[PDB]
């Protein structure tokens, strides 16, 4: 069984729960929760906590960043910097944020500031994609 430690630094998504499979976007690269997934962690990208749970549960929790860890004990330690609520934002808000991130991505000052705007583009892109 899983040890689904899915939780924001503030809140908790799963408390060492025992589910079947799970995935959300990952900076390390998203993949499904498999028992044969080796003891490992991942760098988080903005995802939606998509868990093919052991029970009949697929509860999508939008996630932003952090790191999710899973040990040989299935210590599924989804430590969330921001696991966004279902109602975490407004689609118009994300679209306008994307517009700003693109204009200043058009207004990309330099590879540092451009990288900032690039993260912004990817981020509001995930915003639209979750909205999508």
């Amino acid at each position: 069984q899983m040890s689904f430690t899915f939780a924001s630094p503030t809140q908790v998504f799963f408390n060492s729960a025992n589910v079947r499979q799970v995935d959300v976007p990952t900076q390390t690269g998203a993949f499904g929760i498999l028992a044969a997934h080796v003891p490992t962690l991942q760098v988080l990208r903005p995802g939606l906590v998509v868990v093919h749970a052991e029970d009949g549960t697929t509860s999508k929790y939008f996630v932003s960043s952090g790191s999710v860890t899973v040990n040989a004990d299935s210590s599924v330690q989804l430590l969330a910097e921001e696991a966004v609520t279902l109602d975490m934002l407004d689609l118009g808000a994300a679209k306008a944020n994307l517009e700003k991130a693109q204009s200043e991505l058009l207004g990309a000052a330099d590879e540092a500031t451009r990288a900032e705007i690039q993260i912004r583009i990817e981020a509001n892109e995930a915003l639209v994609k979750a909205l999508e």
Binding site: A7, P39, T40
Partner: protein, 272 residues
């Protein structure tokens, strides 16, 4: 005694007791909020530990560098917090000096800077400030850790003293170890890890370390607030105690001088 000066001391004491009461109340509020937060914080910190806990963490014994990961508060009045902190600190400092590993006193909180004000004062890696200006912020913890990341102090290993608030009364003044991903290079347990890029492994190590910083921060901070509260409590106890005999002798001297002037007048009448 001058019932003038005596009363001066007495009112001083009364004000002191009131002030201690209010301060203890404030600390009660602070540590209560601390405990309230600590619950999810406890889980998060447990998880943060679990990362390196997941493998026999045997860093490079040839660590020519260590790390004196020290955290203090800008605030004080929490008893042996800075004191026991510097105690375990001196212990680990002797131990690491034995190792000759080039450790540097990583700093946040002027209490340590004071502890650092003599103890190998140059050893201070860098002292982040404002420690405890407001409630804990894992974002601010991230900020401090980011400063550390800016620091090219490739500390092969290091330990962070923490007063693990083992209870409200019990603050287990422990130290939290930390290795280097560079040392983490040669692990079969790392070979037992799933397909991790090393800088990605290094960056993730950093992220977990920052999480650990935030967790130790919240724990020691709750310990600090509770310690200040209980300290004020003991202080108020001692204050009431002093005030007891104070008032005793106070009425004693009050009636004493009263009847003293009385007897003076009586004799003066006798003189007439």
């Amino acid at each position: 005694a001058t019932l003038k000066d005596i009363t001066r001391r007495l009112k001083s004491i009364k004000n002191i007791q009131k002030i201690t009461k209010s301060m203890k109340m404030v600390a009660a509020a602070k540590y209560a909020r601390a405990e309230r937060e600590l619950k999810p914080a406890r889980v998060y910190g447990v998880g943060s530990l679990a990362l390196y806990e997941k493998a026999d963490i045997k860093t490079p014994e040839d660590k020519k560098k260590h790390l004196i990961i020290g955290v203090s508060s800008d605030r004080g009045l929490c008893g042996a917090i800075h004191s026991s902190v510097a105690k375990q600190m001196k212990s680990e400092a002797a131990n690491l000096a034995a190792a000759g590993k080039e450790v540097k006193i990583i700093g946040v909180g002027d209490k340590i800077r004071s502890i650092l004000h003599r103890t190998h004062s140059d050893q201070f890696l860098v002292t982040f400030k404002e420690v405890g200006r407001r409630p804990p912020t894992f974002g601010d913890a991230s900020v401090i850790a980011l400063e550390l990341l800016n620091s090219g102090y490739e500390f092969d290993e290091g330990s962070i003293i923490f007063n693990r608030f083992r209870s409200v009364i019990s603050y287990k003044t422990e130290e939290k170890p930390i290795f280097s991903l560079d040392t983490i290079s040669s692990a079969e347990s790392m070979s037992i890890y799933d397909d991790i890029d090393a800088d990605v492994l290094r960056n993730y190590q950093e992220y977990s370390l920052a999480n650990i910083i935030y967790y130790s921060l919240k724990e020691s901070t709750t310990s600090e607030q509770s310690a200040r509260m209980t300290a004020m409590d003991n202080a108020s106890k001692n204050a009431s105690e002093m005030i007891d005999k104070l008032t005793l002798t106070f009425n004693r001297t009050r009636q004493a001088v009263i009847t003293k002037e009385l007897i003076e007048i009586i004799s003066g009448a006798a003189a007439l």
